[PDB]
Design a protein around this ligand. Sequence first.
Ligand SMILES: C=CC[C@H]1c2cccc(C(=O)O)c2C(=O)N1c1cccc(OC)c1
Ligand SMILES: [Zn+2]
Ligand SMILES: [Zn+2]
Length: 230
Amino acid sequence: YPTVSEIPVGEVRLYQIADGVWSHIATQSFDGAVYPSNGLIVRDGDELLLIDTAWGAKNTAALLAEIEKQIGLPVTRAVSTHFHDDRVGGVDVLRAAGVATYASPSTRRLAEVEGNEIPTHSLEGLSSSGDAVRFGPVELFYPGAAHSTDNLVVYVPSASVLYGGCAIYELSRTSAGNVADADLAEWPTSIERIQQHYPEAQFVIPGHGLPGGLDLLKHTTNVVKAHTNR
Ligand SMILES: C=CC[C@H]1c2cccc(C(=O)O)c2C(=O)N1c1cccc(OC)c1
Ligand SMILES: [Zn+2]
Ligand SMILES: [Zn+2]
């Protein structure tokens, strides 16, 4: 799996998780350091559903070019899973490319307040923790507040792929990361809802770093709780 040192900023890599399911991986500078960042691509017949931008206008253009090169099906819809720039930065590129962009009303509001790019369409039915709605070939799930108050997770039932987004940490992380927008007290409860709702997930994809299995869920709870204790 690609690492930050192996991906120059501005390039995007794709990685088959399972049939018709890819992650996309990019790198971006934030406050003077470079970080890797993941999203998801899910085949939707002869179209593609995109989960999250590649963290910036130029990265997201590179994302679309790499999808066209490697997959060759059009991206028709995109869902952003919270309001931070690594999720919505590039939405303007997507919209101009003909992609219909979606996010919860919470994400759209927070993005606007923050001065970030704003998905066009509002995803209703996800404002209460435990809410689940169908969106093409995936289920969208609001687990409750965690990394941010608006963070969504995405399940691909055909492939048993659980995309946790930035509410889920990779196994190599032992300290909490950026908690500025987080709800540390609710984060374990939110993970518990994910665990109970998707107990058959075979692959778990964090928002940043290496994918793994279901242990990424308990691992994230461990890290968040240890931060709170300490
Ligand atoms: C700050 C690091 C960049 C990225 C990242 C990489 C690796 C781990 C994490 C983490 O969850 O701590 C993050 C994270 O939060 N990011 C982020 C991206 C855009 C806006 C933002 O504002 C709060 C934060
Ligand atoms: Zn974030
Ligand atoms: Zn993130």
